[model samples]
Target chain A: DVKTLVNQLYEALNVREHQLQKEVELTTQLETLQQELLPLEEKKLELEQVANRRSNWMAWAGLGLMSVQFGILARLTWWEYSWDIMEPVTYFVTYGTAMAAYAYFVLTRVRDRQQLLLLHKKAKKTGFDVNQYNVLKDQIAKLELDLKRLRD
Target chain B: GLSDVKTLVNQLYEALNVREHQLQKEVELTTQLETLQQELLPLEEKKLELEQVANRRSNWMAWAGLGLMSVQFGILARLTWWEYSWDIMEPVTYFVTYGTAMAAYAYFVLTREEYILNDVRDRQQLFDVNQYNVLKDQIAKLELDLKRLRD
Candidate 1:
């Protein structure tokens, strides 16, 4: 009977909504991670800029820093002196590429929080997990509290 | 099939929910824009008014200077009479007083205008926020609709 169908729908909707709350949490967490990553990026770029400086003193200081006994061991273990110029460049390219990859993953992957969202949305095309929406009324309250506390 | 019905209904539900979310976002953006526009209007009017008042004072000074110089030469002919003329002392005193007061007033107005401009910059953040909200709402709604139709 459609009566049982209604109960099934209601139960599924309830469960799905619960799931969505978690996904939004995940999204919020990912945003936090991105914020944390910014300072790292800034520091990396600052270092990379130093490494790329065309000044003779800067190059000498860099070469000196790399030529210590530890530097020799590091080079023997994993680095190439011939490609020293490419070190900073490679780090930045790799990190920058990694940043881009994470961005795409967050935007396109959709379910870093509760992968069940992808599953539920596929099973039934609910935009938000209703369970999450129900819980979100509270989660949002907390988020708002934290947001208000954050200084511009 | 029951599966087909579920799919169709789910699509409808998602579509309506999206429209609702978009409408809310647009409403917020409109409100934010209205608040900013309201604040901007008074500042713009005040700036224009101050500029006009400054120009008038400038022009008045020029005319007063010309009149004073002319009176100095003209008074030689009426020198004996000029000593007793109340109008002469009053005009010179009033001219100096008016020029000083107006200059001070104009300087104050310019300073206040600068303060207002700084305030305007602070409020200007809302302009970008409103724009971002409106565009984001429109794009979200469009994508949601497209998905709904495709389903």
Candidate 2:
């Protein structure tokens, strides 16, 4: 009887040893995934850097353009009196045209910025599949439960 | 040849079968666990990528705001103390005021975006960290249980 028990226990040991070997293989797989992730993360960082630079350049350009536009408007208004105009009629026409152009420029910039933000949000959501992550998490939990049941 | 011996042998066979089955269950569980862990890898990488993007954007915005504010201050200082003709002062003052307003607005927007990103980062990190800790604890517990069963 004891011999029979001992032989069976040895079988169990063999099963465990096989599982350990598999665990080792899984460890290697994990390492490989990590190695792949390293380069992917680096690329992501590089792309982000490029995007940041572009965004900063756009912001600066917007400010510069706004400042230049205002400067032109102010300078023209200043010279208007010296250059002489048809009183209120010319005044309204000149000032109105400049104001309209400036308003249009500002609105276009706003729309462009808005569009960029919309695209960024879409890209962020599209690239990371959160639904898949949730599914994986659930699967892991189910497997964990099954493992616990074995212990019980 | 005794009946008692035969009965004991029968019990041992039954015990052996039960133990073998248990070991088989453990092996299957371990395999499943490994598969699940493997599946987690890409999701982890993706999460990290998202975090990197958020953090990079936050950092960029902060620096950009700082740069804008610095330029605004430099212009303000010149307008405050530097001697200039009305012609020069008039346009300079307009530009300086506009820059200051924009700088303030930019800082506000930067802070808002920073807050949003930081909040998301914090929440995600907390959940992931806790989940990792739970998994580690479970693994350790399983090991202890297995050792006890062996004993």
Candidate 3:
């Protein structure tokens, strides 16, 4: 008689058991995704280091080229100065392209970093059910204990 | 009759195994919760340090900007008050105004980036803290459930 009644209560707990399973699984996925950030960040840092050096080199080269152009212009007489406007245009374009490349890579690295951070955060937001699983586990244990108490 | 009794014992043993497994999992979860809680403190402490550093930098920027502006303002006052004009004053005035403006712009951009980064970090910490609280509440509720069933 006690066995069947205890069985009924235990079967009723299947609802909580299923709930507990789903919750635990959801939270486990969240934690697994969150863990990915370690490598995600490290990769970005490596990319940034390379990109930064390139950016700095472009900056220095740009400045030096401009300075040299100014120096050569000041040194030359009006007749001796080359009036090839296309040559100066090409030089300016090269400098501008370097500066633009610098901005492009830096911005790309920044956006990539922000994306990883946001993705990791989304994992936390999606499922946080470890607490519910804990409660269900304790409830199941206590119910079993109550069955034992009645049997005794 | 013996076969019936043997099957009954087997079923009971299986049930107990299930119960023990559930208990084991609960204990495992508690350990994970402990680890998650421990992580919270360090991030919170880091958030505190970030805020302090932001304020320190803000003070530096504020004071630097003020000093520069004061110098630039004094130059303007001198230029306006005196009828005696030197060609040197033109370049000096340009240097004061333009130089200070460029310096301020650079400082603002650099410092604002730091501030934004600090803000992002703080937001990240806040998100993590919230997750920790959610897990904490789950554990608390589980304790409550256990107490309710026991009573």
Candidate 4:
């Protein structure tokens, strides 16, 4: 009878040992993952700042370019250049190139901003995933607590 | 002898109770990990989709910019000398000046686009390779753990 009870206790301890082993492994893994994510999170922050700066630059530069083209057109019209023999040539070559560049700039800016928003959404999702990872980590810690208690 | 046997039974019951509690905790942890992994599946798929879209859009912009600049150059040439031959130096001078400016602006826009495309490609490649390695290692480790647990 004493032998049977001792065997049962031995089995309990055996299970606890296995559980503790897994907890340790998971804890180590979670720590490593967190460490790896740190630099990436920092890089994300840096990228956000860079994107903001770029966006601002595009806005101001685009406005400046538009102003220059508008100035040229107005000057030509006011100076009677629009009625000259080469009016079509001047309008198409000068103003046309500027408008084309502005259009391309607008398209590029819009696309870049869209990508920035996408990255923001991605960061948000990654944040949620990290929260879930933390929850699992906490659960592992709770399991570790039970494991320790059982060992004692 | 009867008293000792009763004491042993009591100890066995306590031991089983402790094991039951631990087993429950183990089960909870396992479920939580499984749920987290399941959530990660969709997140990673979304990331892949986003990267593909970003790459496609970047390529479209680059090619579109190139085509627009080329068309502008063609129109400039046609309009400058459609009726006149290359005999006069004045029309040629006008063409060269406008051509230089357009080429300069195109160079700026296209080079910047090239930089953006390179960056997008870099990030995509780096992230995919890193994630692949991480998942591969995770799978290998999990399989080894399962094998050991089976034994």
lDDT leader: 4
Q: In lDDT terms, how accurate is model 2?
A: 0.55
Looking at model 4, residue A82 earns an lDDT score of 46
Interface RMSD of 2: 11.0
**Total clashing residue pairs per candidate?**
7, 0, 2, 0
Clashing pairs in 2: none
- Candidate 2 lDDT at A40 equals 37
Tens-digit per-residue lDDT, B35-112, candidate 3: 545645655676678879879987996898688788778778777568546543543453345346445545555555
Candidates ranked by lDDT: 4, 2, 3, 1
The local lDDT score (0 to 100) that residue A72 gets in candidate 2 is 61
Candidate 4's residue-wise lDDT over B1-151, tens digit each?
9899789879877766765565664555566546656745765787788889898886777667667756765765565568653334357556765776888799889989999999999989984556654653454344333332433
Error of 3 at A151 (Å): 36
Mind sharing the TM-score for model 3?
A: 0.36
DockQ for the candidate 3 complex? 0.06
Q: Which structure is stronger by DockQ: 2 or 4?
A: 2
lDDT of each: 0.48, 0.55, 0.52, 0.62
Q: Which ten residues in a row have the lowest lDDT in candidate 3 chain B?
A: B126-135
CAPRI band for model 4: incorrect
TM-score per model over all chains: 0.22, 0.35, 0.36, 0.34
lDDT, candidate 1, B1-151, per-residue tens: 5434555555545445454575664565555545545534544566578879879987997798678767755764464365656534533443344345445445555555565456444544422222333334444565565455445
Per-residue lDDT tens digits for candidate 4, residues A1-152, read 66897689778776656876876776675565455446545655676786689779978997998788778777866675644544555545664576567667656646854665566655563432332333344444665576566557
True contacts kept of 1: 0.00
